[PDB]
Design a protein around this ligand. Structure first.
Ligand SMILES: Nc1ncnc2c1ncn2[C@@H]1O[C@H](COP(=O)(O)OP(=O)(O)O)[C@@H](O)[C@H]1O
Length: 280
């Protein structure tokens, strides 16, 4: 699939850098014709078939194809795509209130209500995605943006569809590995993956939202991964003594090794608490 090959600079001005990744950089931008602001994600292309630098065209096209499908308040909207010899440039909906990661770092500790207010939105977005048989495969606080961080109940959007896949056969078996702290045991063990992996990541996010601590994090990536595969986590009293037992129950039902026994996204919304790279 080919994208618009006019110079993006003929149509957009860029400003502040919003984020920086292995082979992607995201910059705030403004469309000249409308004055509307976006986030321009510049993804470096591979220079040769066998190269390890840059992103394969297959992987870029998958991200674009998934983004084109989605429209929901809790996920990002793709506006346009450009390309040139070096980059594919995705013009994405701007989410201007920063990462959930940075919000948590600045506050140090959420109430159980503040955590659920974030969680409920994450769950609604993932319910949408999973309804479409889209697994995100990279859910973590760095990939959840706030629209406006200066309101008591910030609204969020899921970003970074660089690992997302359509799961039309219930599982997929490709090269898929996210951030060690957040990946499910089946990722660690190189097993077939499905929508269930996202539910594990949600459990890890929930634990972090409530405690400020990461359930499986070791001092090295290998230690983190070994902890994940062994389901080596516990609820520290220092962090959870004033957290409800129902909140712990919710996490326990997500941090389950066997993906078949883990809560699904529909289960998570009906749960009584809610119901109203890898190498060193
Ligand atoms: N739509 C957006 N609005 C604002 N910031 C974004 C947006 N998309 C990405 N970012 C920022 O850029 C960072 C890297 O995102 P991204 O490039 O999508 O990840 P990757 O390069 O791993 O695919 C994010 O963690 C975030 O800080």
């Amino acid at each position: 699939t080919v994208f618009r090959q006019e110079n993006v600079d003929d149509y957009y001005d860029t400003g502040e850098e919003l984020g920086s990744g292995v082979f992607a950089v995201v910059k705030k931008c403004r469309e000249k014709s409308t004055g509307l602001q976006y986030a321009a994600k510049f993804i470096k292309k591979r220079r040769t078939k066998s190269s390890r630098r840059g992103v394969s065209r297959e992987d870029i096209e998958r991200e674009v194809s998934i983004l084109k499908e989605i429209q929901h308040p809790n996920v990002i909207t793709l506006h346009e795509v450009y390309e040139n010899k070096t980059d594919v440039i995705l013009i994405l909906e701007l989410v201007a209130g920063g990462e959930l990661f940075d919000f948590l770092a600045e506050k140090e500790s959420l109430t159980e209500e503040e955590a659920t207010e974030f969680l409920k939105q994450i769950l609604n977005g993932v319910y949408y995605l999973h309804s479409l048989q889209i697994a995100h495969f990279d859910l973590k606080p760095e990939n959840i943006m706030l629209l406006d961080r200066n309101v008591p109940k910030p609204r969020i959007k899921i970003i970074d569809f660089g690992l997302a896949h359509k799961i039309d056969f219930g599982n997929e078996f490709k090269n898929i590995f996210g951030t060690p702290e957040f990946v499910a045991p089946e990722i660690v063990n190189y097993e077939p993956l499905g929508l269930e992996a996202d539910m594990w990541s949600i459990g890890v996010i929930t634990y972090i939202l409530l405690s400020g601590a990461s359930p499986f994090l070791g001092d090295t990536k290998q230690e983190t991964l070994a902890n994940v595969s062994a389901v080596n986590y516990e609820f520290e009293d220092e962090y959870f003594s004033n957290t409800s037992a129902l909140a712990k129950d919710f996490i326990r039902r997500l941090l389950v090794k066997d993906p078949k026994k883990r809560m699904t996204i529909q289960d998570s919304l009906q749960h009584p608490w809610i119901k109203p790279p890898q190498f060193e």
